[PDB]
Amino acid sequence: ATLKEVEMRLKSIKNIEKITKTMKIVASTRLSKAEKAKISAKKMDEAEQLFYKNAETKNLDKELIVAITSDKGLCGSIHSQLAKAVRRHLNDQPNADIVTIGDKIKMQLLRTHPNNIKLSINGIGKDAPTFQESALIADKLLSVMKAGTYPKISIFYNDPVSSLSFEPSEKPIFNAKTIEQSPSFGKFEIDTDANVPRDLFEYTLANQMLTAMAQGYAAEISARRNAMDNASKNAGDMINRYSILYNRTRQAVITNELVDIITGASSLG
Amino acid sequence: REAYPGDVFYLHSRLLERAAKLSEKEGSGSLTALPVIETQGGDVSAYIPTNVISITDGQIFLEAELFYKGIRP
């Protein structure tokens, strides 16, 4: 506990306080950006889930689970919360396939279940995602993963209930075979000669994964903003401790060298 | 300094230079020294180790932090 060690650590933690403050501001700016994408996902998803409310498409009786998390880290209690929701839902169906979108939930689930994971999307969270990326992943699910055979499909996303609250959430995807089995299906005049469930299923997959991405993105950035806020506050507090240690070290050092200057000046001839 | 005497570096000098390998014409005898220093709280800035480290031909610095993670020694 020198003066030099304490001064160096005080300088490094003043840099950490300043850098976490800047990161909080930049994350707040991207959050004000991505609220637009969250609203544009939700106001559009209502215009297709309202149909599924009125056409009651309740499924009955080998499952696909898809999670939407980040490629980066440093957002706090998201990367293990949604993994734990995967764990609760996954002990029920241990033979179900998993396609993770995001690096961190991949390094979660590959550590605990390297047999389930069959596809992993990487390269997502650099921006608010658009329809092109989610639609392209929606094509990749029905080109190599063969989700049309799957009876039941669920998407796990991260739901920002408010700014300081969050939620892992399940969102089911009804397959096209289920839609004709819907008790409320024949109210809607649909064609037999146009394959409208066989395309509406893919469009449902597209917009539901788009809502999942443009909602988990805003959830990530809100929780990351809260984490950098706690980092800036704890950095301020521990600077208010180390400044007191710095001052006590400086005073003890000046006194504990003035003692051994004076001590020579009394033991003279 | 630190109320140590003025020549404690000279004290460690004429101890840790009496141990050296002789040449052949003296018979290739040898005395090899391992002084051991207790320090204060993981520190090398103190006046006794800063005298001795400048004298001795190296160091085997033995942090307790590495001891508690199983690295024995």
Report domain extents, chain A.
1-25+228-269, 26-227
CA distances from A28 to A14, A112, A124, A230 (A): 21, 34, 19, 14
Q: Distance between CA A57 and CA A176 in Å, rounded?
A: 10
- A260/B41 touch (CB, cutoff 8 Å), yes or no: no
CB atoms within 10 A of CB B25: 6
CA distances from B32 to B17, B18, B22 (A): 10, 9, 11
- B45/A2 touch (CB, cutoff 8 Å), yes or no: yes
* A260 lies within 8 A of chain B by CB: yes
Task: Please tell me the CATH code under which domain A1-25+228-269 is placed.
Answer: 1.10.287.80
Decide if A187 contacts A224 (C-beta within 8 A): no
Nearest C-alpha in A relative to B2: A260
* A263 lies within 8 A of chain B by CB: yes
Decide if A13 contacts A252 (C-beta within 8 A): no
Nearest C-alpha in B relative to A258: B2
**Per-residue DSSP letter, A161:** S
Give the gap in angstroms from C-alpha B45 to the nearest C-alpha of chain A.
Answer: 9
* One-letter amino acid for residue A176 of the chain: A
CA distances from A47 to A42, A43, A132, A164, A182 (A): 9, 7, 19, 28, 19
- A2/B3 touch (CB, cutoff 8 Å), yes or no: no
Q: Distance between CA B31 and CA A252 in Å, rounded?
A: 43
Give the gap in angstroms from C-alpha B27 to the nearest C-alpha of chain A.
Answer: 48
Question: Can you read off the two tokens belonging to residue B58?
Answer: 């190296």
Q: Which of A1, A132, A8, A137 is nearest to A68 (CA)?
A: A137
User: Which own/partner contact pairs does A20-28 have at CB distance under 8 Å and 24+ positions apart?
Assistant: A20/A228, A20/A231, A20/A232, A20/A235, A21/A228, A21/A232, A23/A228, A23/A231, A24/A225, A24/A228, A24/A229, A24/A231, A24/A232, A27/A221, A27/A224, A27/A225, A27/A228, A28/A225
CATH topology classification for A26-227:
Pyruvate Kinase; Chain: A, domain 1 (3.40.1380)
Question: Can you read off the two tokens belonging to residue A194?
Answer: 């146009």
- B1/A2 touch (CB, cutoff 8 Å), yes or no: no
Residue in A3, A260, A262, A267 to test binding to B, most B beta-carbons within 10 Å: A260
Decide if A82 contacts A67 (C-beta within 8 A): yes
Q: Distance between CA A80 and CA A103 in Å, rounded?
A: 13
